[PDB]
Amino acid sequence: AMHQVISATTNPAKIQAILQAFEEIFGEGSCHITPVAVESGVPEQPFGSEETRAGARNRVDNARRLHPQADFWVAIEAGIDDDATFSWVVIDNGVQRGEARSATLPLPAVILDRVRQGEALGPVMSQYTGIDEIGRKEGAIGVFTAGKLTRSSVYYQAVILALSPFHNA
Question: Which residues bind Mg(2+)?
Fold first, then answer.
């Protein structure tokens, strides 16, 4: 038997975080991840924590509508707030929901000035660093931490944390 985990994203950094976290909690080889492209119903990279979480919740709901027979539906939505980037993780098993926010990454003013004329962080960071599609790789996190952390390793903790309701009490 396997836990069917629908990942509401095709971004490889996010899929890695989800797979590794689910395997750590439920065991190696226990989970099958199906990546799906679904809409959040709002623009990519919401401004504000609550709005970002709303995007993630919307993605989970839409993933459930698309793949109703699975065991878990998971989204990781990146947003901006208090001059930082972060993500919300939302996990639903059809009955219970677990949610956690990732650690924040303070952004430099020169990058914030751009995200505040509406630009997505990824493209801005790709121009700043010269690394194409930086958000599918190690991310702004990778760059500013000199590779000591990555998008994936930070999202990993957040997924583990959001999994708490599904294995305690």
Answer: 39, 69
